[PDB]
Amino acid sequence: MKQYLELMQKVLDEGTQKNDRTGTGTLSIFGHQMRFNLQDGFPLVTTKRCHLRSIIHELLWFLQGDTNIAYLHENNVTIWDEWADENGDLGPVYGKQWRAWPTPDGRHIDQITTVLNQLKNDPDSRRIIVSAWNVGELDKMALAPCHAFFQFYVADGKLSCQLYQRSCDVFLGLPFNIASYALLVHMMAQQCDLEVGDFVWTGGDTHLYSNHMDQTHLQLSREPRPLPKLIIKRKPESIFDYRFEDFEIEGYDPHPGIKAPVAI
Amino acid sequence: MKQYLELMQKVLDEGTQKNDRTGTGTLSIFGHQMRFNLQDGFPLVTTKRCHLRSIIHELLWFLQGDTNIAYLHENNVTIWDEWADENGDLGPVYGKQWRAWPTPDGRHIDQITTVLNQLKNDPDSRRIIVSAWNVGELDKMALAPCHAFFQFYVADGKLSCQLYQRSCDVFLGLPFNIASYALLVHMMAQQCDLEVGDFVWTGGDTHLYSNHMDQTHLQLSREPRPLPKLIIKRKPESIFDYRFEDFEIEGYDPHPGIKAPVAI
Ligand SMILES: Cc1nc2ccc3ccc(CNc4ccc5c(c4)CN([C@@H](CCC(=O)O)C(=O)O)C5=O)cc3c2c(=O)[nH]1
Ligand SMILES: Cc1nc2ccc3ccc(CNc4ccc5c(c4)CN([C@@H](CCC(=O)O)C(=O)O)C5=O)cc3c2c(=O)[nH]1
Ligand SMILES: Nc1nc2c(ncn2[C@H]2C[C@H](O)[C@@H](COP(=O)(O)O)O2)c(=O)[nH]1
Ligand SMILES: Nc1nc2c(ncn2[C@H]2C[C@H](O)[C@@H](COP(=O)(O)O)O2)c(=O)[nH]1
């Protein structure tokens, strides 16, 4: 997509060479923001085929408050398998924090239910936030939230969302995070009777692994095509009742998929 | 400063009229980002006069883990007065979150010292973050954190910082948050032996209160002056050891102040 490709080039052009944890080396920039008008179409990359299916399951796994890759294996999403323990557990990652943040004093806050209720009762609120960055439980997580903090906003009947992404694998994960967050805005907007506004993506350490270069070069030379359109086939009774069959993508005609190694 | 004056102009030009908790009415945009290379000068607004002293004291206060206004009062910081209880207590706002976020298992993590330790030992880390957003104690806070989450980054021996501000009164508060975080950067960079890099500001609901329009327009008719220079006259044994007297601002010749009413 235009915004995506320009960020990729921007990493190539100004990225600083860093030695990372994995000892693979990255090309990195710090602080970037991009905006997606969701009224223009679903922000699914067309320069490399992406599977809306793995996107939708990882999203519904989070809203359910699940931290076990079982549901994810059974639906062929496997990215998370190298991070789980022998039981399939990740610790209190995303899903746990969104649905049950543990208070220092034995209770749990359900941040999606709060957000829903604020969108329905107090849309002007400047505090419609979801944080996965639970300082207190970071050491128990297999991986510290990458997509860590997000805020909603309504202006004239439209729901916008801004995400803060502390660390971003530009080639592999970015396509995934943009579609997932676009999808949630779509689902939050239907449950709440709002129109879709913009998806604002803000990044911290935004990088390209030194081993995604040929594949990045390959991608930068394809012509982005018209964005697809999302269809939500049924309006479930709650934000929690969605299912895969409920979503469809019209006019998605990507360039063939591009394979690349995951850095572990 | 150019970035700040361009942000003001942007809310005026693309902001939408929003109702707010205060009943005042704002003009606001959602999602913005600006960068200040700290090597160009200290980002203290010059198109209206700001007092570096009251910016220092508020930060020294955060760095001490204090949430009582007494220290602020002994030094003439009255902005927080109205938020404070009868005892001068604000609840676990910023400073407590910063120095002692309470975990579920009876621990308290000091995020300032952790970031300092990460800066010295693993500067390439993608998770050098301080969050003030403790979902678990928000209900105990006089005001939910506005400057909520920040991340450090090192590249080429320079320390950069990105702050995510969920709610921003552009006229009154922003000059203050910009200067405060650029001082924190200078202090971290001095302790860790780094040079100052960039301060990146990212905003959520960025607004002008309805009643700041004339002041805003008056400010905007002014031409920015050269940026002041910051001099630290000592190297304390810790980030916790700066005194108001260790800092000098040179070359600050601002236009006259403009007052505007605070919305409560
Ligand atoms: C280095 C690295 N590590 C990660 C570790 C865990 C992640 C979990 C989720 C996401 C983003 N969300 C999804 C959601 C689904 C898929 C993928 C990512 C990747 N993916 C692959 C590989 C996954 C699979 O083969 O099942 C593909 O191209 O088909 C998926 O089905 C990214 C990472 C990254 C990531 O992007 N990069
Ligand atoms: C509507 C609104 N409400 C607030 C509530 C609490 C705040 C706390 C801190 C800051 C940001 N930081 C400082 C730090 C010190 C000072 C000021 C702001 C403003 N200030 C005033 C004096 C007002 C006062 O001292 O009571 C000035 O006009 O110079 C200070 O000494 C802003 C707010 C806002 C804010 O900017 N706007
Ligand atoms: N874009 C994207 N990158 C991810 C995601 N999860 C992990 N990564 C990448 C960021 C880093 O490249 C690496 C995680 O390492 P670290 O930043 O050190 O926590 O994996 C994700 O959901 N999206
Ligand atoms: N710029 C700036 N604005 C602040 C700060 N603290 C409070 N405000 C403003 C944001 C809003 O106008 C109001 C806080 O209100 P609310 O967003 O509803 O929680 O105060 C601060 O440090 N900086």
XYZ file of C-alpha atoms and ligand atoms in Angstrom:
648
model
C 0.000 0.000 0.000
C 1.430 3.513 -0.666
C 2.094 4.351 3.048
C 3.677 0.951 3.702
C 6.114 0.996 0.717
C 7.216 4.501 1.622
C 8.044 3.385 5.171
C 9.956 0.391 3.761
C 12.051 2.716 1.520
C 12.511 5.163 4.380
C 13.990 2.284 6.443
C 16.427 1.400 3.589
C 17.461 5.019 3.055
C 17.909 6.224 6.669
C 17.823 3.123 8.881
C 20.783 2.813 11.223
C 22.576 -0.629 11.313
C 21.899 -2.229 14.766
C 22.981 -5.562 16.201
C 19.750 -6.920 17.794
C 19.001 -9.582 20.388
C 18.781 -12.406 17.814
C 22.186 -11.305 16.540
C 20.865 -10.980 12.962
C 21.251 -7.220 12.630
C 18.496 -4.774 11.536
C 18.087 -1.523 9.603
C 16.215 0.773 11.987
C 14.573 4.187 12.378
C 12.880 5.633 15.471
C 9.484 7.368 15.475
C 7.298 7.103 12.392
C 3.532 7.590 11.963
C 1.184 6.655 9.124
C -2.540 7.163 8.650
C -5.174 5.005 7.008
C -8.554 6.447 6.091
C -10.742 3.326 6.507
C -13.403 4.890 4.275
C -10.939 4.319 1.337
C -10.788 0.512 1.785
C -9.346 -2.204 3.968
C -5.632 -1.588 4.604
C -4.550 -5.047 3.475
C -1.219 -4.961 1.501
C -1.679 -5.781 -2.163
C 2.043 -5.927 -2.978
C 2.380 -9.300 -1.343
C -0.585 -11.591 -0.824
C -1.694 -11.631 2.848
C -4.103 -14.130 4.413
C -7.039 -12.335 6.002
C -7.663 -15.634 7.854
C -4.603 -15.713 10.092
C -5.374 -12.007 10.809
C -8.921 -12.699 11.888
C -8.017 -15.672 14.175
C -5.175 -13.879 16.011
C -7.669 -10.969 16.550
C -10.504 -13.188 17.883
C -7.935 -15.133 20.070
C -7.012 -11.712 21.742
C -10.643 -10.535 22.284
C -11.388 -13.904 24.018
C -8.508 -13.293 26.488
C -6.518 -16.414 25.469
C -2.870 -16.793 25.943
C -2.558 -20.436 24.708
C -1.562 -21.074 21.095
C -3.978 -24.064 20.979
C -6.789 -22.123 19.293
C -4.055 -20.713 16.976
C -2.625 -24.175 16.010
C -6.085 -25.624 15.344
C -6.612 -22.730 12.813
C -3.199 -23.028 11.311
C -1.810 -19.690 12.683
C 1.630 -20.795 13.734
C 3.762 -17.646 14.303
C 3.326 -17.937 18.045
C 4.437 -21.605 18.451
C 8.171 -20.969 19.079
C 7.249 -18.705 22.062
C 4.868 -20.957 23.946
C 6.026 -23.416 26.710
C 5.297 -27.209 26.466
C 1.684 -26.523 27.538
C 1.176 -23.939 24.724
C 1.333 -20.959 27.180
C 2.791 -17.496 26.480
C 2.158 -15.927 29.882
C -0.181 -12.957 30.276
C 0.322 -11.524 26.773
C -2.058 -9.352 24.818
C -5.332 -11.228 25.280
C -4.780 -11.429 29.049
C -4.247 -7.695 29.570
C -7.106 -6.568 27.219
C -9.673 -8.704 29.036
C -8.349 -9.195 32.640
C -5.701 -6.717 33.769
C -4.901 -7.802 37.343
C -5.087 -5.021 39.932
C -2.405 -5.105 42.709
C -5.422 -6.028 44.887
C -7.072 -9.193 43.444
C -9.604 -7.795 40.933
C -9.427 -7.721 37.073
C -10.261 -4.801 34.768
C -11.815 -5.782 31.357
C -10.476 -3.055 29.107
C -12.639 -3.975 25.975
C -15.907 -3.823 27.986
C -14.703 -0.453 29.460
C -13.907 0.839 25.919
C -17.252 -0.377 24.586
C -19.166 1.318 27.350
C -17.186 4.557 26.922
C -17.868 4.519 23.193
C -21.536 4.024 23.969
C -21.916 6.456 26.903
C -19.011 8.995 26.588
C -17.754 9.187 22.981
C -15.974 12.482 23.512
C -13.778 10.959 26.203
C -10.034 11.543 25.691
C -9.366 8.435 27.856
C -10.621 5.576 25.595
C -7.484 3.507 25.909
C -6.359 -0.112 25.904
C -2.844 -0.956 27.229
C -1.174 -4.338 27.020
C 1.966 -2.808 28.728
C 1.413 -4.228 32.211
C 4.748 -3.334 33.866
C 4.043 -5.718 36.754
C 3.632 -8.765 34.535
C 6.291 -8.109 31.837
C 8.631 -10.724 33.249
C 5.996 -13.515 32.928
C 5.286 -12.778 29.202
C 7.069 -14.925 26.530
C 7.381 -11.643 24.628
C 6.687 -8.065 25.740
C 3.819 -6.466 23.823
C 4.985 -5.053 20.453
C 1.541 -3.378 19.744
C 1.387 -2.030 23.284
C -1.076 0.820 23.669
C -4.066 1.987 21.550
C -6.626 4.730 21.899
C -10.007 5.342 20.293
C -11.617 8.651 19.397
C -14.999 9.707 17.961
C -15.360 12.982 15.996
C -18.607 13.499 14.010
C -20.026 9.939 14.177
C -16.655 8.287 13.125
C -14.419 5.949 15.206
C -10.666 6.349 14.749
C -7.916 4.419 16.502
C -4.258 5.215 17.079
C -1.821 2.439 17.895
C 1.646 2.903 19.578
C 4.027 0.092 18.382
C 7.251 -0.082 20.334
C 8.991 -2.564 18.018
C 8.138 -3.455 14.476
C 9.398 -6.040 12.012
C 8.443 -4.004 8.917
C 8.487 -6.884 6.364
C 6.858 -9.688 8.393
C 4.525 -8.331 11.041
C 3.441 -4.817 9.936
C 1.016 -6.031 7.240
C -0.607 -8.132 9.972
C -0.957 -5.411 12.660
C -2.458 -2.873 10.211
C -5.251 -5.254 9.040
C -5.949 -6.569 12.601
C -6.324 -3.019 14.012
C -8.416 -1.955 10.939
C -10.584 -4.996 11.614
C -11.119 -4.102 15.350
C -12.172 -0.521 14.450
C -14.681 -2.101 12.012
C -16.024 -4.421 14.798
C -15.965 -1.691 17.472
C -17.836 0.710 15.001
C -20.635 -1.884 14.281
C -21.232 -2.742 17.975
C -21.417 1.003 18.671
C -23.260 2.336 15.616
C -20.399 4.588 14.357
C -18.768 5.054 10.950
C -15.058 4.066 10.420
C -12.633 7.032 10.703
C -8.855 6.582 10.451
C -6.380 4.018 11.663
C -3.246 5.967 12.946
C -0.093 3.781 13.247
C 2.779 5.179 15.353
C 6.035 3.214 15.651
C 8.919 3.039 18.065
C 11.928 0.968 16.821
C 10.741 0.282 13.240
C 13.093 -2.184 11.482
C 13.941 -4.418 8.608
C 16.018 -7.544 9.391
C 19.314 -7.597 7.377
C 17.959 -10.845 5.873
C 14.707 -9.421 4.412
C 16.536 -7.190 1.916
C 16.094 -9.170 -1.330
C 12.424 -9.691 -0.421
C 12.047 -5.952 0.455
C 13.713 -4.963 -2.861
C 11.339 -7.392 -4.687
C 8.303 -5.764 -2.939
C 9.362 -2.160 -3.523
C 9.134 -2.866 -7.277
C 5.473 -4.017 -7.446
C 2.535 -1.744 -8.156
C 0.204 -1.335 -5.307
C -3.390 -2.014 -6.391
C -6.800 -0.667 -5.273
C -7.566 -1.636 -1.668
C -10.111 -4.367 -0.978
C -13.369 -3.845 0.915
C -14.429 -5.513 4.117
C -17.920 -6.864 4.613
C -19.205 -7.864 7.995
C -21.858 -10.436 7.101
C -23.685 -10.454 10.464
C -24.016 -8.157 13.452
C -23.416 -10.408 16.458
C -24.930 -9.472 19.805
C -21.480 -8.528 21.252
C -17.880 -7.598 20.218
C -17.040 -11.036 21.580
C -19.434 -13.023 19.382
C -17.644 -12.618 16.089
C -16.452 -15.559 14.159
C -14.482 -16.124 11.089
C -17.464 -16.757 8.730
C -18.641 -13.195 9.554
C -15.959 -11.447 7.498
C -15.307 -11.302 3.782
C -12.867 -9.353 1.538
C -14.021 -8.089 -1.905
C -11.644 -6.911 -4.692
C -8.474 -8.265 -3.107
C -6.053 -9.001 -5.904
C -2.540 -9.088 -4.557
C 0.827 -9.808 -6.128
C 2.028 -13.298 -5.115
C 3.135 -13.906 -1.563
C 6.865 -13.365 -0.641
C 8.570 -15.879 1.725
C 11.018 -14.776 4.325
C 12.665 -16.293 7.404
C 11.398 -15.374 10.906
C 14.104 -14.046 13.260
C 14.294 -16.006 16.512
C 9.125 27.317 17.704
C 8.197 26.218 14.161
C 6.827 22.757 15.056
C 4.520 24.061 17.813
C 3.237 26.995 15.649
C 2.574 24.473 12.799
C 0.718 22.161 15.216
C -1.509 25.138 16.375
C -2.211 26.082 12.687
C -3.034 22.444 12.038
C -5.744 22.221 14.730
C -7.196 25.494 13.465
C -7.283 24.135 9.893
C -8.350 20.521 10.362
C -9.729 20.405 13.841
C -13.320 19.398 14.383
C -15.441 20.907 17.173
C -15.682 18.419 20.136
C -17.646 18.606 23.419
C -15.588 17.775 26.501
C -15.852 16.662 30.108
C -15.151 20.235 31.285
C -18.122 21.630 29.254
C -15.695 24.181 27.599
C -15.592 22.858 23.994
C -12.377 22.197 22.091
C -11.221 22.096 18.504
C -9.290 18.885 18.086
C -7.421 16.623 15.750
C -6.445 12.970 16.438
C -2.906 11.766 15.749
C 0.024 14.082 15.242
C 3.816 13.724 15.482
C 6.593 16.267 15.686
C 10.383 15.937 16.163
C 12.837 18.335 17.920
C 16.575 17.567 17.415
C 17.883 18.527 20.840
C 21.282 19.478 19.330
C 19.622 22.442 17.594
C 18.693 24.069 20.918
C 16.489 23.649 23.936
C 12.870 23.520 22.845
C 11.374 26.168 25.174
C 8.688 28.180 23.261
C 9.800 31.736 22.421
C 6.590 33.145 20.884
C 5.211 33.507 24.401
C 7.214 33.435 27.707
C 7.410 30.158 29.680
C 9.212 29.848 33.086
C 11.909 27.269 33.040
C 11.856 27.190 36.840
C 8.351 25.880 37.171
C 9.141 23.174 34.397
C 12.227 21.996 36.428
C 10.359 21.682 39.695
C 7.568 19.675 38.211
C 10.120 17.212 36.759
C 12.274 17.049 39.923
C 8.929 16.163 41.642
C 8.132 13.321 39.187
C 11.721 12.013 39.563
C 11.300 11.924 43.399
C 8.140 9.674 43.193
C 6.099 12.502 44.920
C 2.282 12.880 44.380
C 1.678 15.649 47.011
C 1.614 19.324 45.965
C 3.565 20.659 49.008
C 6.902 20.634 47.159
C 5.183 22.175 44.179
C 3.799 24.938 46.457
C 7.104 25.752 48.310
C 8.376 26.514 44.718
C 5.348 28.264 43.176
C 3.835 25.597 40.961
C 0.121 25.959 41.345
C -1.169 24.137 38.269
C -1.910 20.993 40.216
C -3.627 22.740 43.121
C -7.214 22.169 41.943
C -6.650 18.461 41.339
C -5.459 17.933 44.927
C -7.386 16.747 47.889
C -7.464 18.565 51.272
C -4.159 16.903 52.218
C -2.540 18.000 48.884
C -2.726 14.416 47.553
C -3.123 13.699 43.874
C -3.190 9.865 44.225
C -0.704 7.731 42.317
C -0.161 10.031 39.390
C 3.063 10.085 37.355
C 5.846 10.083 39.939
C 4.543 7.057 41.854
C 4.046 5.116 38.581
C 7.506 6.126 37.499
C 9.322 5.109 40.749
C 7.077 2.374 42.010
C 4.454 0.793 39.824
C 2.751 -1.831 42.057
C 2.709 -5.372 40.647
C 0.116 -8.081 41.470
C 2.597 -9.979 43.722
C 3.628 -7.250 46.142
C 6.582 -5.879 44.257
C 7.090 -2.298 43.036
C 9.137 -1.619 39.959
C 11.178 1.589 39.585
C 11.033 2.261 35.807
C 13.468 5.181 35.895
C 16.270 3.047 37.322
C 15.405 0.203 34.983
C 15.666 2.510 31.923
C 18.961 3.890 33.183
C 20.254 0.302 33.629
C 18.970 -0.618 30.117
C 20.714 2.535 28.659
C 24.122 1.560 30.116
C 23.941 -2.207 29.469
C 21.697 -2.879 26.451
C 21.143 0.400 24.578
C 19.984 -1.477 21.453
C 16.960 -2.803 23.385
C 13.535 -2.245 21.817
C 11.836 -2.165 25.244
C 13.229 0.837 27.150
C 9.818 2.161 28.122
C 8.331 4.022 31.149
C 4.475 3.915 31.269
C 2.414 6.023 33.632
C -0.816 4.223 32.448
C -1.570 1.788 35.353
C -5.062 0.617 34.416
C -5.243 -0.963 37.891
C -4.990 2.418 39.724
C -6.547 4.891 37.342
C -9.571 5.056 39.703
C -7.270 6.331 42.462
C -5.630 9.145 40.364
C -6.782 12.801 40.579
C -6.218 12.917 36.770
C -5.390 9.886 34.438
C -1.896 10.483 32.955
C -1.841 12.796 29.871
C 1.847 12.202 28.968
C 1.350 8.480 29.359
C 4.094 6.290 27.845
C 7.582 7.131 26.521
C 10.334 5.068 24.836
C 14.159 5.625 24.626
C 16.345 4.779 21.714
C 20.102 5.031 21.122
C 21.705 5.221 17.646
C 25.139 6.681 16.869
C 25.760 7.512 20.580
C 22.706 9.834 20.783
C 19.730 9.330 23.050
C 16.253 9.889 21.469
C 12.906 9.660 23.265
C 9.348 9.329 21.971
C 6.375 10.318 24.145
C 2.730 9.336 23.404
C 0.371 11.913 24.893
C -3.214 10.800 25.006
C -4.771 14.296 25.626
C -3.120 17.658 24.983
C -4.294 21.187 25.732
C -2.060 22.746 23.010
C -2.072 26.293 24.292
C -1.466 25.892 28.009
C 0.296 22.622 28.580
C 2.336 21.594 25.534
C 5.191 24.126 25.854
C 5.575 22.675 29.342
C 5.632 18.955 28.347
C 8.022 19.627 25.468
C 10.667 21.359 27.656
C 10.235 18.820 30.491
C 10.928 15.724 28.318
C 13.826 17.522 26.549
C 15.308 18.107 30.069
C 14.762 14.446 31.058
C 16.620 13.536 27.835
C 19.608 15.823 28.694
C 19.692 14.292 32.251
C 19.545 10.610 31.031
C 22.140 11.394 28.311
C 24.459 12.946 30.973
C 24.177 9.940 33.315
C 24.762 7.357 30.607
C 27.463 9.329 28.734
C 25.394 9.803 25.516
C 24.801 12.920 23.410
C 21.176 14.264 22.987
C 19.350 13.002 19.898
C 15.744 13.754 19.108
C 12.624 14.217 21.265
C 9.589 12.886 19.218
C 6.183 13.987 20.429
C 3.081 11.970 19.405
C -0.425 13.080 20.324
C -3.799 11.455 20.690
C -6.611 14.077 21.078
C -4.655 17.297 20.430
C -6.799 20.332 21.125
C -7.327 24.018 21.532
C -10.030 24.950 24.062
C -12.722 27.200 22.474
C -11.618 30.004 24.742
C -7.982 30.026 23.615
C -8.744 31.086 19.980
C -7.854 34.756 20.405
C -4.669 33.954 22.388
C -3.751 31.334 19.838
C -4.083 33.798 16.917
C -2.104 36.491 18.742
C 0.715 33.954 19.420
C 0.665 32.829 15.820
C 1.296 36.415 14.606
C 4.678 36.258 16.277
C 7.965 35.189 14.797
C 9.913 32.505 16.696
C 13.297 33.518 18.050
C 16.530 31.445 18.067
C 16.199 28.530 20.571
C 17.831 28.846 23.986
C 20.793 26.651 25.017
C 20.864 24.430 28.051
C 23.918 24.211 30.308
C 24.205 21.640 33.154
C 27.016 22.887 35.523
C 27.588 19.571 37.297
C 27.325 15.761 36.928
C 25.442 14.422 40.016
C 25.989 10.790 41.119
C 22.424 9.893 40.002
C 19.442 11.162 37.946
C 17.814 11.546 41.359
C 20.433 14.101 42.382
C 19.947 17.164 40.159
C 19.133 20.409 41.948
C 17.300 23.327 40.398
C 20.696 25.205 40.496
C 22.533 22.803 38.221
C 20.792 24.057 35.091
C 21.204 27.324 33.247
C 19.270 28.467 30.174
C 21.214 30.839 27.951
C 19.912 33.116 25.206
C 16.184 33.004 26.040
C 14.555 36.203 24.733
C 10.851 35.326 24.404
C 7.901 37.462 23.268
C 5.646 38.506 26.144
C 3.420 35.940 27.830
C -0.297 35.682 26.970
C -2.704 34.382 29.581
C -5.499 31.960 29.014
C -7.951 30.258 31.367
C -7.483 26.670 32.509
C -10.475 24.351 31.834
C -11.348 22.216 34.932
C 10.738 -11.572 14.293
C 9.255 -11.578 14.425
N 8.738 -12.241 15.402
C 7.318 -12.348 15.659
C 6.881 -13.114 16.738
C 5.523 -13.227 17.003
C 4.586 -12.563 16.219
C 3.207 -12.735 16.472
C 2.281 -12.061 15.694
C 2.688 -11.258 14.636
C 1.682 -10.514 13.767
N 0.416 -11.311 13.660
C 0.440 -12.449 12.760
C -0.683 -13.226 12.518
C -0.626 -14.334 11.651
C 0.600 -14.626 10.995
C 1.729 -13.835 11.258
C 1.681 -12.732 12.147
C 2.803 -14.454 10.425
N 2.150 -15.569 9.620
C 3.181 -16.135 8.626
C 3.993 -17.178 9.465
C 2.872 -17.708 10.512
C 2.426 -19.126 10.095
O 3.314 -19.626 9.128
O 1.429 -19.749 10.561
C 3.028 -16.089 7.087
O 3.531 -15.386 6.127
O 2.055 -17.028 6.687
C 0.899 -15.744 10.028
O -0.038 -16.551 9.815
C 4.037 -11.134 14.323
C 5.020 -11.769 15.101
C 6.394 -11.657 14.822
C 7.049 -10.810 13.647
O 6.410 -10.161 12.814
N 8.406 -10.815 13.526
C -7.097 22.057 30.990
C -5.743 21.746 31.499
N -5.605 21.155 32.639
C -4.361 20.789 33.270
C -4.332 20.094 34.474
C -3.137 19.771 35.084
C -1.915 20.080 34.465
C -0.706 19.691 35.025
C 0.484 20.014 34.457
C 0.536 20.635 33.205
C 1.864 20.819 32.443
N 2.996 21.377 33.158
C 3.135 22.602 33.895
C 4.149 22.886 34.837
C 4.198 24.103 35.498
C 3.230 25.073 35.181
C 2.226 24.799 34.234
C 2.158 23.552 33.556
C 1.433 26.052 34.033
N 2.071 27.051 34.983
C 1.400 28.347 34.782
C 0.781 28.945 36.071
C -0.599 28.387 36.466
C -0.386 27.946 37.946
O 0.975 27.999 38.243
O -1.400 27.653 38.621
C 1.721 29.499 33.764
O 0.830 30.147 33.108
O 3.112 29.817 33.737
C 3.021 26.462 35.688
O 3.741 26.797 36.627
C -0.668 20.976 32.539
C -1.911 20.719 33.187
C -3.142 21.074 32.574
C -3.313 21.801 31.157
O -2.374 22.118 30.457
N -4.542 22.087 30.763
N 5.297 -5.870 13.279
C 5.429 -6.723 14.233
N 6.655 -7.040 14.611
C 6.617 -7.913 15.674
C 5.507 -8.349 16.302
N 5.827 -9.171 17.381
C 7.173 -9.209 17.342
N 7.730 -8.456 16.372
C 9.131 -8.293 16.097
C 9.712 -6.920 16.673
C 11.142 -7.410 16.802
O 11.573 -7.562 15.445
C 11.029 -8.789 17.474
C 10.680 -8.780 18.949
O 11.812 -8.435 19.676
P 11.913 -7.321 20.815
O 11.626 -6.072 20.115
O 13.272 -7.365 21.246
O 10.885 -7.649 21.809
O 9.868 -9.286 16.826
C 4.226 -7.928 15.870
O 3.050 -8.198 16.266
N 4.233 -7.126 14.832
N -0.688 19.658 27.142
C -1.023 19.125 28.269
N -2.295 19.096 28.493
C -2.605 18.563 29.703
C -1.772 18.067 30.674
N -2.467 17.606 31.765
C -3.761 17.876 31.417
N -3.933 18.448 30.186
C -5.158 18.765 29.566
C -5.666 17.641 28.579
C -7.069 18.035 28.669
O -7.363 19.315 28.094
C -7.333 18.136 30.178
C -7.253 16.616 30.887
O -8.393 16.088 30.617
P -9.050 14.752 30.136
O -8.337 14.478 28.873
O -10.496 14.627 29.950
O -8.581 13.658 31.112
O -6.095 18.683 30.638
C -0.413 18.096 30.394
O 0.606 17.782 31.033
N -0.181 18.652 29.218
